[PDB]
Amino acid sequence: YEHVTVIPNTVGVPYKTLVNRPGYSPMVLEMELQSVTLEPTLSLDYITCEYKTVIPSPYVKCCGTAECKDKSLPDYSCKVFTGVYPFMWGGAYCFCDAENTQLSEAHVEKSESCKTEFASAYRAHTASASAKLRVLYQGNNITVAAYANGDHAVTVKDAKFVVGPMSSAWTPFDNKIVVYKGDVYNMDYPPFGAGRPGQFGDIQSRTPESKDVYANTQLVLQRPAAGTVHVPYSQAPSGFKYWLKERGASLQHTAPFGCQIATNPVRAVNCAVGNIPISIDIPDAAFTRVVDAPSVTDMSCEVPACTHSSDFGGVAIIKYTASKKGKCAVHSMTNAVTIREADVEVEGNSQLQISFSTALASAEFRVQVCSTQVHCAAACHPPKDHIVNYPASHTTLGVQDISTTAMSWVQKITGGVGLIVAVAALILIVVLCVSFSRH
């Protein structure tokens, strides 16, 4: 048959699915998702890195007035200071006393570190989800992988199946992402050609080997001191170089639902959000006829010890009588109880012991062993320890939750008043019917 089931997107919890083909022995398939990766579509917007301030030797125009030449360099700065009289080791460089000027010129370029040390601004929009699933099929562990969109059929060992699409479209990535070596940050980076000085993005280029670059660094040249040969200028505090200090916390620690972020390629691993639909078709060769499977009779179930905990704290011993030797599927018809073992080997007039997990204090549940249900009545105790290092697997419980004496107690509390109300209604009726024969 074509079997459709939906399992929650939670890593480390094995889910068993009951396939019921009419006239055939039920089949239990155990599936556990190892990893769910969300690789978003990346769009490289730009790269940012450390700048290099190329400052040449100042043009000292001796006995003349210097003139600035208009170049198309990024953040090109030129300033001509009059009345400069620079001094060297052996005195004045200039023969003239006052008509000498200093031309200061400076321009900004990318540093060499831009090829190795860099931050990338990417635009992430949509994510392609893919999952690796382990299935206990016919006593064997098989590992499959496919992208979970519902349009990628994978047939292994004659089993055809398709996975997804995800019920929830939530993603930890926003529209704007910034990637640095092994760290990803959700940041609304400034757009390209509009950076602010001293902020993230003060110098921007499109690719690591491009030749044009955008710069807004506020380079302002100051007048040099009297008789001093040097080029004073206003510092351009690189936003990228101190970016490494006010980063806060990366998405690896801040993303909800325990998403793990990796790079090269960037991906979100094990995001515990929603459930996933999986459809598995399998022909009749895996199925076994009801006549070919062994039948059973005189089933009894006893729970000598039970504790409702994360581990298999419940153990149930079922005494039975079978007809022949063979493999039988065990399945709980009650969602509150989960059995670790999926398939047993039945022989004849023997007894079986199974391990189960439940969250309810009492457990009245029917187990369909060899296509036949048996009722088991249990009571389970709370455990001694408060913190477990592995998550639970019995979580499916609500408010209509059966228990021990509790519902007998709420029965005994419900000794209502309707009898006294009825005898007062009787008195009211016998007062009305003295003269109320008409209306």
Ligand X SMILES: *[C@@H]1O[C@H](CO)[C@@H](O)[C@H](O)[C@H]1NC(C)=O
Dist CA 184 CA 421 (whole Å): 71
Considering beta carbons, is residue 125 or 181 the nearer one to ligand X?
Answer: 181
From the list 8-16, 50-58, 144-152, 305-313, the region that binds a copy of itself by CB under 8 A is 305-313
From the list 268-276, 306-314, 362-370, 410-418, the region that binds a copy of itself by CB under 8 A is 306-314
Question: Which H/E stretch holds residue 428?
Answer: helix 418-432
116 makes contact, choosing from ligand X, a copy of itself, none, with CB < 5 to 8 Å by partner type, with ligand X
Task: Determine if 313 is a binding residue for a copy of itself (CB under 8 A).
Answer: yes
**Pair 186, 175: CB distance under 8 Å:** no
CB burial of residue 121 (10 Å; 0-12, 13-18, 19+) = buried
**Pair 381, 360: CB distance under 8 Å:** no
Task: Determine if 305 is a binding residue for a copy of itself (CB under 8 A).
Answer: yes
From the list 84-92, 138-146, 303-311, 335-343, the region that binds a copy of itself by CB under 8 A is 303-311
Go through the chain and tell me how many residues it has: 439
Considering beta carbons, is residue 181 or 230 the nearer one to ligand X?
Answer: 181
DSSP reduced 3-state for 413 = helix
Considering beta carbons, is residue 318 or 342 the nearer one to ligand X?
Answer: 342
Task: Determine if 306 is a binding residue for a copy of itself (CB under 8 A).
Answer: yes
Q: Which of 71, 245, 253, 384: binder of a copy of itself (CB under 8 A)?
A: 384
Dist CA 271 CA 267 (whole Å): 10
Task: Determine if 307 is a binding residue for a copy of itself (CB under 8 A).
Answer: yes
Task: Determine if 302 is a binding residue for a copy of itself (CB under 8 A).
Answer: no
DSSP reduced 3-state for 136 = strand
Tell the smallest beta-carbon distance from residue 13 to ligand X (Å). 13
For residue 279, which phi and psi values (nearest 5 degrees)?
A: -115, 125
Dist CA 434 CA 313 (whole Å): 69
40 makes contact, choosing from ligand X, a copy of itself, none, with CB < 5 to 8 Å by partner type, with none
Considering beta carbons, is residue 269 or 315 the nearer one to a copy of itself?
Answer: 315
Positions that interact with ligand X (CB under 6 A)? 115-116, 139-141, 181
Among residues 57, 186, 81, 183, the alpha carbon closest in space to that of 123 is found at: 186
Tell the smallest beta-carbon distance from residue 23 to a copy of itself (Å). 4
Task: Determine if 388 is a binding residue for a copy of itself (CB under 8 A).
Answer: no
Considering beta carbons, is residue 114 or 166 the nearer one to ligand X?
Answer: 114
Task: Determine if 438 is a binding residue for a copy of itself (CB under 8 A).
Answer: no
- Residue 325 has which token pair? 């030797």
Task: Determine if 404 is a binding residue for a copy of itself (CB under 8 A).
Answer: no
Tell the smallest beta-carbon distance from residue 328 to ligand X (Å). 17
Cα–Cα distances in Å, from 154 out to 19, 157, 158, 175, 227? 19, 10, 10, 32, 81
Contacts with a copy of itself, 7-46, as mask; x by CB under 8 A: ---------------xxx----------------------
Which ranges in 11-82 belong to alpha helices (H)?
Answer: none
Q: Strands of 230-325 (E only): list them.
A: 260-262, 267-269, 275-281, 296-306, 314-322
* Contacts of 276 by beta carbon, 8 Å cutoff, 6+ apart: 6, 7, 8, 9, 33, 131, 148, 163, 164, 166, 167
Tell the smallest beta-carbon distance from residue 70 to ligand X (Å). 36
Residue 120's beta-bridge partner residues? 47, 179
Considering beta carbons, is residue 27 or 306 the nearer one to a copy of itself?
Answer: 306
- Residue 236 has which token pair? 């351009």
Considering beta carbons, is residue 139 or 415 the nearer one to ligand X?
Answer: 139
190 makes contact, choosing from a copy of itself, ligand X, none, with CB < 5 to 8 Å by partner type, with none
Tell the smallest beta-carbon distance from residue 25 to a copy of itself (Å). 9
SS (H, E, C) 139-158: CEEEEEEEECCCCCCEEECC
Bond into 40 cis (ω within 30): no
Which residue type is seen at 383?
P
Residues in 355-374 that interact with a copy of itself by CB under 8 A? none
Among residues 203, 184, 207, 182, the alpha carbon closest in space to that of 194 is found at: 203
Give the number of residues in contact with a copy of itself, rule: CB under 8 A. 10
Residue 130's beta-bridge partner residues? 37, 147
Considering beta carbons, is residue 141 or 404 the nearer one to ligand X?
Answer: 141
Considering beta carbons, is residue 32 or 109 the nearer one to ligand X?
Answer: 32
Considering beta carbons, is residue 1 or 170 the nearer one to a copy of itself?
Answer: 1
Tell the smallest beta-carbon distance from residue 306 to a copy of itself (Å). 7
Q: What is the DSSP letter of 405?
A: T
- Site residues for a copy of itself per CB under 8 A: 1, 22-24, 305-307, 313, 381, 384
